[PDB]
Structures are given as structure tokens and as C-alpha cells.
Design a protein around this ligand. Sequence first.
Ligand SMILES: *[C@@H]1O[C@H](CO)[C@@H](O[C@@H]2O[C@H](CO)[C@@H](O)[C@H](O)[C@H]2NC(C)=O)[C@H](O)[C@H]1NC(C)=O
Ligand SMILES: *[C@@H]1O[C@H](CO)[C@@H](O[C@@H]2O[C@H](CO)[C@@H](O)[C@H](O)[C@H]2NC(C)=O)[C@H](O)[C@H]1NC(C)=O
Ligand SMILES: *[C@@H]1O[C@H](CO)[C@@H](O[C@@H]2O[C@H](CO)[C@@H](O)[C@H](O)[C@H]2NC(C)=O)[C@H](O)[C@H]1NC(C)=O
Ligand SMILES: *[C@@H]1O[C@H](CO)[C@@H](O[C@@H]2O[C@H](CO)[C@@H](O)[C@H](O)[C@H]2NC(C)=O)[C@H](O)[C@H]1NC(C)=O
Ligand SMILES: *[C@@H]1O[C@H](CO)[C@@H](O[C@@H]2O[C@H](CO)[C@@H](O)[C@H](O)[C@H]2NC(C)=O)[C@H](O)[C@H]1NC(C)=O
Ligand SMILES: *[C@@H]1O[C@H](CO)[C@@H](O[C@@H]2O[C@H](CO)[C@@H](O)[C@H](O)[C@H]2NC(C)=O)[C@H](O)[C@H]1NC(C)=O
Ligand SMILES: *[C@@H]1O[C@H](CO)[C@@H](O[C@@H]2O[C@H](CO)[C@@H](O)[C@H](O)[C@H]2NC(C)=O)[C@H](O)[C@H]1NC(C)=O
Ligand SMILES: *[C@@H]1O[C@H](CO)[C@@H](O[C@@H]2O[C@H](CO)[C@@H](O)[C@H](O)[C@H]2NC(C)=O)[C@H](O)[C@H]1NC(C)=O
Lengths: 96, 702, 50
Amino acid sequence: SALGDKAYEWNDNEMYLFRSSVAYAMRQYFLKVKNQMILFGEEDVRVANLKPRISFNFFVTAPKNVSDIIPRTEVEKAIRMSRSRINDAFRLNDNS
Amino acid sequence: TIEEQAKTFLDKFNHEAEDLFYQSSLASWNYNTNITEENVQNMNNAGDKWSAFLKEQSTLAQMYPLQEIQNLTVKLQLQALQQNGSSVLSEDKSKRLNTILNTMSTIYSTGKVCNPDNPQECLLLEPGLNEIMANSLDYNERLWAWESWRSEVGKQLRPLYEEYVVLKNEMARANHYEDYGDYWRGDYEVNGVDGYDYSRGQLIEDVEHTFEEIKPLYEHLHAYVRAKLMNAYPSYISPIGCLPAHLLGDMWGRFWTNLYSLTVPFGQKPNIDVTDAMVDQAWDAQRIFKEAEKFFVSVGLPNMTQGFWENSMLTDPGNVQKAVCHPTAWDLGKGDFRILMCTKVTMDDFLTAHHEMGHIQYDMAYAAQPFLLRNGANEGFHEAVGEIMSLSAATPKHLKSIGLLSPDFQEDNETEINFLLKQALTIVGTLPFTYMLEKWRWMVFKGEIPKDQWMKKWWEMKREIVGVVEPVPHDETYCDPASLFHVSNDYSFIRYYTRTLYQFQFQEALCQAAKHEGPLHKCDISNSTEAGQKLFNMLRLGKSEPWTLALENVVGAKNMNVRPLLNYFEPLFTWLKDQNKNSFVGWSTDWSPYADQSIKVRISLKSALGDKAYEWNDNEMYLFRSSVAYAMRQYFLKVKNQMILFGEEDVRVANLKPRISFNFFVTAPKNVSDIIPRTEVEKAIRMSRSRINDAFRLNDNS
Amino acid sequence: DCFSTNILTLINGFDLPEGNVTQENFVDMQQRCNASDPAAYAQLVFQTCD
Ligand SMILES: *[C@@H]1O[C@H](CO)[C@@H](O[C@@H]2O[C@H](CO)[C@@H](O)[C@H](O)[C@H]2NC(C)=O)[C@H](O)[C@H]1NC(C)=O
Ligand SMILES: *[C@@H]1O[C@H](CO)[C@@H](O[C@@H]2O[C@H](CO)[C@@H](O)[C@H](O)[C@H]2NC(C)=O)[C@H](O)[C@H]1NC(C)=O
Ligand SMILES: *[C@@H]1O[C@H](CO)[C@@H](O[C@@H]2O[C@H](CO)[C@@H](O)[C@H](O)[C@H]2NC(C)=O)[C@H](O)[C@H]1NC(C)=O
Ligand SMILES: *[C@@H]1O[C@H](CO)[C@@H](O[C@@H]2O[C@H](CO)[C@@H](O)[C@H](O)[C@H]2NC(C)=O)[C@H](O)[C@H]1NC(C)=O
Ligand SMILES: *[C@@H]1O[C@H](CO)[C@@H](O[C@@H]2O[C@H](CO)[C@@H](O)[C@H](O)[C@H]2NC(C)=O)[C@H](O)[C@H]1NC(C)=O
Ligand SMILES: *[C@@H]1O[C@H](CO)[C@@H](O[C@@H]2O[C@H](CO)[C@@H](O)[C@H](O)[C@H]2NC(C)=O)[C@H](O)[C@H]1NC(C)=O
Ligand SMILES: *[C@@H]1O[C@H](CO)[C@@H](O[C@@H]2O[C@H](CO)[C@@H](O)[C@H](O)[C@H]2NC(C)=O)[C@H](O)[C@H]1NC(C)=O
Ligand SMILES: *[C@@H]1O[C@H](CO)[C@@H](O[C@@H]2O[C@H](CO)[C@@H](O)[C@H](O)[C@H]2NC(C)=O)[C@H](O)[C@H]1NC(C)=O
């Protein structure tokens, strides 16, 4: 819908880029609000239920602690804060 | 008181201190001779009691102001008993500091790294990794060991070091000192002598003055070693650049001696070696000590008492019992001196026996002095005095005169050159490292180096003082200097500089007094009563007078001097100047081992965005590294048809500037030594430049 | 345009922040960079447009 023609193919490298973008967003939110330097990585974004529609679930954990799961509220806040950067990193616009 | 009550206090303190300390020495000696569990607690309680006695004696010394004291000896003893130490620090802060020191020591002692292709084979430092660094001739293996040890140790030791420096600085400031560095430098401080004073701040100036004179010989030696390292690692070392840090035969580059097998001047002709003559004559591990005692007697110095010879543990048992046999001299006191060592039949054991014999002679020379004054003049005198005996005894002339090394031997100057170069690799190769490390620590304590720039400054010094370049860039998360044993265990490092200067000053003075033909490297002082008298004139003083006065009694100088060292190494300097006609003597602080394959990036945010432009920080650097990794993954998948998992930690970044310009390069995922060539990175960036640009809202010019 | 190019060449040569050397403060910064270290300012070629 966003690209029509000239659209790229989605593979595991695009999943890596998406995980990196989400980690960057969480880092930015934690730095700019809570004033904490937390080193979120792309291995803290756990992804499940991948479908050919390109739909999946994800959640975020603490950098070195699998038991600690960041609640959905601040994940929503971070996505709201950095949605524009997330979108233009992939050439999609808020509907795609 | 006053004088009478102070003398009574000192006498009654010493009357107990002698026997407490004596029993503690028996406990330690009995532990060391045989490892017995029942004596461990005996050592522990005795040491705790001795520490409590010292603490209480310190507490009962506060009611003695220092302005009413006329005698100098009691003044020095009261000052040596007056320092608070860690007592003034708060209880919670003291507990925190002790915990952090213990954690630091434990991390250094029991940290291990692991192979990237066999994670079930992991090596400690002193076994394995040290041998990898000391014996391997492979560039890749040495680089792997270097980088892998530095990574984990720095990452674990950084925050602990920051908290430790903060706490130590606060404690030192609480004790009327500028910082911790001033407290460390205060060992050489002497006052109230009206003619021999030495300020704390003069030490820095003296050290810089000495290094400025030592620089040229080190420059020639560095150029010679760099020239000789080409044949071992071709296409890896620049003819005008520095030396890579991992090729120096040691983990940290403290000593260069392990390069002697690669840099020998004449390898076909060996140096002197008669260790087989001692084997042929069937010399047990008892004649060497008697020979050392005879040599010491010859100069007129006092001899060994029968009490020492009564207690002899030097013969290694070799049974199932395992005990440490590190050569040491024990000074339990009240006429009780011993040496504990494992004695074999070898040259190095012979020289170590002479070293320990000199240690014992110096230690018992000042026995008549009071207990609190039973020590060397400063921290550097003891080792220098112990070492110059072995240095004088190692000459082949003494070997010929002692019975070995039959006179039908015509010495060649090639052997002398080999010996001088081997000595240089140990003596001159370590002075820049010591100077640089102590300088960095002093300016870190003093606050000159911001906590943000530590790593930066450190490596800058290594490119300009030592002439050594790192093989991979290190960001601010590392603590490379903390990898040393001395820094992470809170030890001082300037004693190794001052001792190296003092030993050669003493050797030159002794040779000049003995009226040697020429003291180049073959000087010996055997059978010279005046030399022994001159040495004894300084040995027996102890700490009763400033070390400057002790130095004047031998060399007639009030400060450290470098001329005797240059005089000692003059023949090698002449040979090196002859051998470096074609080489470019010196180095340049711009060449880097990774600079050929790097790519420069310059970013102009204001031009592309104007207003509303975002601020650039480390999160943007993380995003840039991730984008570059994605680009490399895509290129390798879509052209070479290989599934390689590049990460954001394989993009190494250097030279960050406020213009937002930096260099970067890419390595293989788990292999650090493997660097992707610049052409492939160019192709990948060409392929994915559109996505790289649009991820940051910049357009091909910004 | 000529003045902007003259600013840009110095900015690139000396790796200064973009937005520090403007039209009003070009000469003082230009001579300060030269006074910092010769033999690196020398290779910079400036235009004398007026
Ligand atoms: C990982 O995260 C959990 C919390 O999700 C941490 O668990 C805490 O552990 C301390 C123990 O002193 C408890 O007092 C806390 O109540 C625990 N938090 C809970 C139950 O929510 C755990 O310590 C973390 N592991 C780390 C940092 O290594
Ligand atoms: C530790 O080693 C020594 C010698 O092997 C032994 O104990 C010593 O034995 C001698 C007798 O020759 C005594 O003079 C010493 O007093 C003993 N040392 C002591 C009691 O500390 C024995 O093998 C071990 N000593 C132990 C277990 O105490
Ligand atoms: C140490 O204190 C004493 C004063 O009690 C002084 O030294 C004494 O000087 C006389 C000489 O007439 C000697 O007979 C004494 O044996 C000395 N007593 C000592 C050394 O304890 C002087 O004030 C100081 N002596 C020093 C620093 O050598
Ligand atoms: C060691 O620490 C104690 C602090 O208890 C210092 O004692 C202080 O001495 C000063 C100077 O006379 C007095 O003004 C304080 O009242 C003392 N504090 C006390 C007794 O609690 C002691 O001087 C320190 N030792 C030094 C600096 O050498
Ligand atoms: C210092 O000790 C040495 C021992 O190495 C003495 O040399 C021998 O000492 C014994 C005494 O037990 C004498 O019987 C020998 O005549 C001495 N000479 C030899 C070759 O064995 C030496 O005399 C002592 N030096 C002194 C007292 O000035
Ligand atoms: C070692 O000794 C030989 C001869 O003793 C040296 O050869 C002479 O050295 C002098 C001065 O260096 C030169 O002027 C002569 O031309 C040399 N050849 C002769 C006299 O035939 C040799 O240079 C020395 N080599 C080292 C490394 O010391
Ligand atoms: C890691 O580093 C290098 C790659 O640069 C690999 O070494 C290459 O392969 C063998 C070693 O067995 C040697 O010929 C050279 O060291 C290198 N040859 C080249 C670059 O042509 C090394 O094997 C790699 N180790 C791995 C992947 O486990
Ligand atoms: C700035 O660069 C010029 C380039 O030469 C130098 O200026 C010298 O000093 C004064 C400046 O007023 C002139 O009279 C000289 O002709 C200049 N050239 C010389 C001495 O060779 C110098 O590098 C720098 N000058 C200043 C003021 O910063």
C-alpha cells in the first residue's frame, strides 16, 4: 500500500533493522525523560508470531536480565516519541 | 619533661613492639616453610593483635605536638607513627573502599577469556595467556590474546576504578594533602634539615629532567628494534611509524627482553655460558652460598653468623608437599635473619642467591638502629643495593677468578655487544613505560584529565612518549591501564625508576672508588676494602638521616643523575649510531595499523535541516553502526550468497570530532584480526546509501 | 556564495562545529586557527572575493 511498485522484499535483515530501531527508541526515551543511561541492544527486543502478512508481536526486556520485562506503558510512550524516525527509516507513513 | 616523657613512651612502645612483631614473624615463617593449616589461624590472630597494638599506639601519640621537639630521631619516629591512614575515613566509606579493593584484586586474579571457536577451553592470565604472549610468533594469535584480555578486564574494572579514585582522593584530601598523588610522592619529602630539603613537587621536575636526557638512546634502540622486527612480521610494520602494542613480547610491554631471540646481533656466536661446568663438577646447592659469603667477606663487609647457617631450607624437598619457594629475605629481628628460596644449579639461581645475600647484608647492617628506623633510606634504595652486588658478581672476570671459566679463553667484542643489548632490552626498554604510567596516574588523581577523556589521553601518551600504537581503537568503556597488576592492587610505580637510576649511580661510585681501569660494563669491586668501607658508611644509617645525606656520603650528590647510565651503555650507543645510518631514527604519531582500510564520514546536520535539527549523541552513533551493519549484511547476502551475521559491534569507530566526522572500519563477526577490505565496504555503502541517508533525514551532500 | 565556500573550506580543514564561524566572526577565527598551528593552515586555499 505504501510503495506499490519498487517495493523491497522483507527478510531477516529488515527484522534486524527493525529491532535496532526499537532499541534506539527505547534508549532515547530512557535518556530524555528518566535521565538514565541504559544500554538497550537489539537482542533485548524479543519477537514472536511472524506471518506472511508481516505482522508480529514484540516485547522488550532489561539489557542483561531476562526476568525483567519493560511494561507496555513506557514501550508505548517510546514508540509515540520516536514513531516519525521509525517510519522514515523504512519509507512507511503512519498507515503502513 | 616533654622530651623525657616522649622517650619513655617510645621505649615502652618498642619494648612490646619487638616481641609482638617477632612472634608474627615466626608465624609467617612457619607458614611459609611448610603449608600447615593449624598455623594459619595462629598467623591471623597474631597479625590482628599486632595491628591492634599499632592502632592503639597511634591513638596514644596524638598528645605530642611537633613544634616542641628538638631531637631529630624522636621527631622522625613520631612522624612515622603519626600518619592516620584510613582511620579518618568514615566507617561506611572505609567498608566500601575495602570491598572495592577486594573485588578489584579478585577480578584481576580469577578472570579468564575464551577461544571463539571452542568456548569450552578457557585460559587464566599467568598460565597460558602469558605463555601465548611470550612465545607465540603468530600475529593473529597475539592480537586475539591482547584484545580479548583487554576487553573483559577493562569492562569489569572501569566503574570500580572510578569509585576507587574518588574515594582515595577524598580520603587524601581529608589528610591535608592536595590529592592521592601528593600522598604517594610524600615518601621522598624531607624537611627540617636546613641544607638537604626536598619538596614533594620537585620530584616531577627531576623525573622530567632525567627523561629528557634518556630520550635519544631509547630512540636509537627503538629504531633498531623496529628495523629488526620487519623480517619477523613483514607487511605489518611501517618503516616510519610506531610499533604495534601486541608485538612487544609481553602483555603490557613492560619489558622488551622477550624480543632478544628475534633481535640478537650475532646469533651464530652465543654469549658466555658455563652452567654445564658447574654440572660437570657435581656442585650441590651448598657451594654457591659459601662462595657468595666469601665474596662478601673479601670486601671487608661483616660476615654471616652461625644462626643463619643453622636454619637452612634452601634445598627443595620435592615431595608431595607444595609450598611457595619465591626467593625472599626474612628479617624477624633480634639477630634473626634468614633467606627462603628453592635452590637449583643454574646461573640465574646463582645471581638470585647473590641478590638475596646482599639484601640480607643490607638488612642486618642497620640492626643497631632503633626498631622504628630499621628500613632503607627510601623505597628505591633496598632493591638497588641488593641488585648491584649481583651486577658486579655477574662479570666473567669474577668467574675466571673464582675457579671456573679457565683462562684459555679470548673474549670477543661480539659477546660484549650481545650482553649489552640483552641488558638494554630490560633496563632501557622499561623506563618510558614507568614514566608514562606514573605521569598518567598522577594527572588522573590531580584532576587534570577529565573522567570523560581518560582513555583518549592514555593512548595519546603512548603514541608520543613510548612510541607504541594500539591495533584497534578503544572507546571510553575500557580501562587498559587498570589491566596492570600494580594499578589494580594500589601500588606505587616510581620506585622502579628511582632504583634504576640509583643502582647505576652506586655502581659508578664504587668503580671510581676502587680505581678500575675503565668502568664500561666489565667493572668488578672484588678484593677492595676501601669500597666495602664506603658502602658500609651508607648501609648502617637506615632512616636516621635524609636519603640525600646518605647519597652524598657515597656519590657526593643531592639528586638523581643519569650520566652513569649513559656511560654504562656508551658502547651500545656507538654501535647503534653506526648501525642506523640508513634507518629513519624516530617515529611519527599519525600512522595506525588500521588506518589503511578505514573510511571517513563527515555529517552536516545544520545545512540539511537548519531549524528543528536534532542533537547528535551516542544513540545516533548506535543507530549509524546498526545501519552500516545492515548494509554489509545485505551486500553479502545479495552478491556473495553468504549468510554472515554482522553486528553493530563489528563497526569500529575512531576519531570523533565536534564537526561530526569520524573514521570507521568493519571486521568479521567473531574474528577481530580479520578486517573487511575497503573495496567491499565501498560497494556495500554504494548499494545501500539511499536507506542510510533516509534513516537520518540527510541527502547525499550532508 | 563565495563567502560561504570560504567558510566551508576552513570548517572542513580544521573540523570545527558547523555554525561557529559566521560572516561577522570570520577573520578573528581564521587568524586564531592559523595561530594555533602553522603548516596545516598553509595548505588551505582561500578566495579574496569582495
Ligand atoms: C532482574 O529483574 C528482577 C526483577 O524483575 C530482579 O529481582 C529483584 O531482586 C531483589 C533481590 O534483592 C528483590 O528485592 C526484588 O524484589 C526483585 N524484584 C522483583 C521481585 O520485582 C533481579 O534482581 C534482577 N536481576 C539482576 C539485576 O541481576
Ligand atoms: C611441616 O614440615 C616440617 C618439616 O617437614 C615438619 O614439621 C617440623 O618438623 C621439625 C622436625 O624436624 C620440627 O623441628 C619443626 O618444629 C616442625 N615444624 C612445625 C611444628 O611447625 C612437618 O612436616 C610439618 N610441620 C607441622 C605439620 O607442624
Ligand atoms: C636525640 O635526643 C638527645 C637528647 O636526649 C640528643 O642526643 C644526645 O646527645 C648526647 C651528646 O652529649 C649523647 O650522649 C646522647 O646519647 C644523645 N641521646 C640520643 C641520641 O638519644 C639529641 O637531642 C638527639 N640526638 C640525635 C638526633 O642524634
Ligand atoms: C589524625 O586524626 C585525628 C582526628 O581525630 C587528629 O586529631 C586532631 O588534631 C587536631 C590538631 O591538633 C585537633 O584540632 C583535633 O581536635 C583533633 N581531633 C581529634 C583529637 O579528634 C590528628 O591530628 C590526626 N593526625 C595527624 C593530622 O597527623
Ligand atoms: C667471617 O666469616 C667467615 C666464614 O665464611 C670467616 O672465615 C672463616 O671463619 C672460621 C671461623 O669459624 C675460621 O676458622 C676460618 O679461619 C675462617 N677462614 C676460612 C677460609 O675458613 C671469616 O674469618 C670471618 N671474617 C672475620 C671474623 O673478619
Ligand atoms: C669487533 O672487533 C673487531 C676487531 O677487533 C672490529 O673490527 C674493527 O673495528 C674498528 C672499529 O670499529 C674498525 O675501525 C676496523 O675497520 C675494524 N676491522 C679491522 C681492525 O680489521 C669490529 O668492528 C668489532 N665489531 C663489533 C660489533 O664490535
Ligand atoms: C581469523 O583471522 C584470519 C583472517 O584474516 C584467519 O587467518 C587466515 O587463514 C590462515 C590461518 O589458518 C592463514 O593463512 C592466515 O592467518 C589467514 N589467511 C588469509 C587471510 O588468507 C584466521 O583463520 C581466522 N580464524 C577463524 C575464522 O577462526
Ligand atoms: C598567520 O599566518 C601568516 C602567514 O605568514 C603569519 O603571519 C606572519 O606574522 C605577521 C602577521 O602580521 C606578518 O607580518 C608576517 O609576514 C607573517 N609571516 C611570517 C613571519 O613569515 C603567521 O603564521 C600568522 N600570523 C598571525 C598574526 O597570526
